[PDB]
Amino acid sequence: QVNRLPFFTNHFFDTYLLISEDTPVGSSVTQLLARDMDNDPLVFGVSGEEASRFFAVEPDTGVVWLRQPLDRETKSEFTVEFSVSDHQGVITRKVNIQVGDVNDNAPTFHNQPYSVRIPENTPVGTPIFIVNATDPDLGAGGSVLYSFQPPSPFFAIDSARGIVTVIQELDYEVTQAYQLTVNATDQDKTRPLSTLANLAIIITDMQDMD
Ligand SMILES: [Ca+2]
Ligand SMILES: [Ca+2]
Ligand SMILES: [Ca+2]
Ligand SMILES: [Ca+2]
Ligand SMILES: [Ca+2]
Ligand SMILES: [Ca+2]
């Protein structure tokens, strides 16, 4: 019986291999599995420059491990080729890789620093500022809610829109400036992430002696 080449048996050679982006470097991703009808000893590998940058393959076993972090936010799908040889010949076969998203970004505020000057006689109800953050994670992990931390008795903030309003009469003679902490938190159900930003509110002294 003349030589037959080995063949792979993993299902993912027909469909795709989904790997979560939170897979730690150094962790195994899968094991390549193959059969050689001559019962030859096998050597497993990875074929291609980019593929070899992200994946290492144990030659004696076909265990695939991660060499560099995956990042769904940079590249979420790509192709690799894996190899198996019986020391006589070698086959290479493509696999579609999809990188699975996790919530691994907190929100980023834009156009900082935040500051605004308002008169001490600004009427309650007046909108005075709009904060802005974004978050690149998918789904609920990319949805941002705003709040003041702790809640302010002088200013409200719309948790969806980021619009800040005056909610109590101001008084320069008591407070000449506020330094408010804005919290932006994403809405991931399992592991929400937060970012803080300052909003400085400078109060203009008005000639308001009673
Ligand atoms: Ca063989
Ligand atoms: Ca990421
Ligand atoms: Ca992510
Ligand atoms: Ca997020
Ligand atoms: Ca006053
Ligand atoms: Ca005054």
UniProtKB/Swiss-Prot annotation:
Illness: Defects in Cdh23 are the cause of waltzer (v) phenotype. Waltzer mice are characterized by deafness and vestibular dysfunction due to degeneration of the neuroepithelium within the inner ear.
Function noted in UniProt: Cadherins are calcium-dependent cell adhesion proteins. They preferentially interact with themselves in a homophilic manner in connecting cells. CDH23 is required for establishing and/or maintaining the proper organization of the stereocilia bundle of hair cells in the cochlea and the vestibule during late embryonic/early postnatal development. It is part of the functional network formed by USH1C, USH1G, CDH23 and MYO7A that mediates mechanotransduction in cochlear hair cells. Required for normal hearing.
Protein's UniProt name: Cadherin-23
Glycosylation, residue list: N132, N183
Domain notes: Three calcium ions are usually bound at the interface of each cadherin domain and rigidify the connections, imparting a strong curvature to the full-length ectodomain.
Record annotation: effect of changing R4I: Strongly reduced affinity for PCDH15
Cadherin domain span: 11-109, 110-210
Assembly description: Interacts with USH1C and USH1G. antiparallel heterodimer with PCDH15. Isoform C1: Interacts with CAMSAP3; leading to inhibit CAMSAP3 ability to induce microtubule bundle formation.
Localization annotation: Cell membrane
Organism: Mus musculus
Domain of life: Eukaryota
Phenotypic consequence of N3I: Strongly reduced affinity for PCDH15
Tissue: In adult animals relatively high levels of expression are found in testis, skeletal muscle, heart, eye and thymus, and lower expression in kidney, lung and brain. Found in the sensory hair cells of the inner ear.
